[PDB]
Amino acid sequence: AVVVKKDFRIDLENELFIRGEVTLVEDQIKKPVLVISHGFRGYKDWGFWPYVAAWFAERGFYVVHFDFSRVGALNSGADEASVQKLSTVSRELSDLDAILSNLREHRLPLAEQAETERISLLGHSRAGGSNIIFAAEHSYIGSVIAWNGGPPPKNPNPFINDDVEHNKQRFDTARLLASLTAPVLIIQGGKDREALLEGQQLLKEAAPNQTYISIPDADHSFGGEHPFHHTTPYLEEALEVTHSFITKHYLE
C-alpha cells in the first residue's frame, strides 16, 4: 500500500524549466495516466495537489503533476514582464506539450509503469480550459476533467490580451467541446463567482453531449485552500465523481 513520489525536472528553452512529480503505487503493471495541471494562482505542492495525486495513485493511476514553467520563472527571480509573458494560455499548451512528450517518450520516472494508451487530463480553474484545448488538439488524450473551469480564456497582463486576441478561433472551448468526440467532465461548485457560472451554463448549452456536474455548496477550491490539514466533503465528492467518470469512459 506504498505510494512512491519521484521528482523530476524538465529543462526548457532559455533558463525555463518544469518541476513535477510522478506519484504511483508500484505494481508490475502499466497503469492509466492522470496528468494534473494546477491553477494560475496555484502550484504543485499547494493545497490538495499532493493529496489528490496520492488519492488517485492509491486508486490505480500513474499520476503526473507539475508546476507550469511560469512558477519556476517566478521562483527563479524573473522580472514581472517575463512572468506575465509566461502566463499565457499558449504557454500552458506548450508546457503541457513538454510534459506529455517526456511521458510518451518514457523519459519520466517509472515510465515503464505508465500506460500511455490511457491518458487523461485534470485541470483546475483555467487549466480546465487550456487542458480542454490541448485535449481537442491531440489524439492521444482520451478524456479530460475540468474543476471549476472550462469556458474560453477571457488585464494587467498585455500578453494574455494579445494571446486571446490572436487565438479567438483556437481557444473557443464551446466550439471544441461540441465537436470533440472524447469525453469531457466539467465539475463546477455552486458557491463560485457569477461570471463563471454563466460561462459554465453557456458551455453546457453549446455542448450538451458532454458531462456537467455541479457541487452546490462548494467554493472555487472545494475548500482545499492551503495548507492541507484534512479533506472536505466537497473535495471528496469531486474526487469520487472524477474517478467514476474516468472509470465508466474507460470501458467504452
Side-chain angles (χ1 to χ4, degrees):
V2 69
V3 171
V4 317
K5 312 157 184 201
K6 289 286 172 211
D7 286 312
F8 68 82
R9 167 150 162 162
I10 293 173
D11 288 285
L12 303 183
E13 76 255 60
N14 317 135
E15 288 140 343
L16 302 183
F17 56 96
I18 289 171
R19 286 196 181 275
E21 301 172 60
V22 164
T23 305
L24 159 66
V25 170
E26 296 197 275
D27 304 314
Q28 306 324 314
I29 84 186
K30 301 171 306 220
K31 298 206 192 180
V33 167
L34 186 51
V35 184
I36 289 166
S37 316
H38 60 63
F40 153 88
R41 274 313 163 228
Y43 55 97
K44 87 178 172 60
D45 305 310
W46 167 270
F48 56 55
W49 284 138
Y51 174 76
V52 166
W55 191 92
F56 276 114
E58 284 180 354
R59 291 156 174 87
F61 287 76
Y62 177 106
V63 180
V64 172
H65 64 117
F66 63 106
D67 294 314
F68 285 109
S69 69
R70 83 216 168 196
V71 166
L74 206 44
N75 299 355
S76 278
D79 42 314
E80 205 200 66
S82 281
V83 172
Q84 266 180 339
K85 196 181 199 204
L86 289 158
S87 304
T88 59
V89 160
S90 294
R91 195 54 202 213
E92 298 187 29
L93 295 169
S94 155
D95 285 358
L96 259 185
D97 207 83
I99 280 277
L100 271 302
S101 295
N102 278 262
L103 162 85
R104 282 175 93 249
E105 295 171 19
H106 297 265
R107 300 194 161 280
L108 300 177
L110 295 199
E112 80 270 3
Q113 291 172 81
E115 177 42 87
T116 44
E117 286 188 343
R118 316 265 180 169
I119 291 163
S120 315
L121 298 191
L122 177 57
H124 196 200
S125 291
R126 159 218 164 107
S130 48
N131 274 244
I132 278 170
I133 287 156
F134 188 96
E137 304 192 338
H138 293 75
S139 279
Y140 54 85
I141 299 305
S143 74
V144 45
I145 297 100
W147 282 0
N148 300 313
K154 267 176 119 152
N155 232 339
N157 209 336
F159 304 87
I160 285 190
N161 288 321
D162 197 307
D163 196 43
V164 186
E165 195 192 307
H166 290 217
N167 285 313
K168 326 186 226 181
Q169 274 276 308
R170 187 180 175 183
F171 303 167
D172 173 11
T173 74
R175 165 185 109 69
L176 294 186
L177 267 196
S179 95
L180 174 63
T181 48
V184 178
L185 167 55
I186 286 197
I187 306 191
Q188 175 63 63
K191 294 200 187 333
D192 202 338
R193 180 200 172 99
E194 317 81 24
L196 168 65
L197 316 174
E198 312 192 346
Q200 270 317 137
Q201 202 71 24
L202 276 192
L203 227 49
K204 188 175 160 212
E205 281 151 22
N209 47 312
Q210 301 299 6
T211 314
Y212 304 85
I213 300 291
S214 186
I215 302 193
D217 297 306
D219 59 49
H220 196 48
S221 302
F222 306 122
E225 298 93 21
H226 184 80
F228 193 85
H229 289 302
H230 63 89
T231 195
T232 84
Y234 308 134
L235 188 60
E236 293 297 289
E237 193 194 5
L239 289 185
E240 211 69 69
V241 160
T242 296
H243 193 267
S244 280
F245 169 82
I246 306 170
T247 278
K248 88 180 251 183
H249 293 234
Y250 186 103
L251 297 166
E252 212 56 62

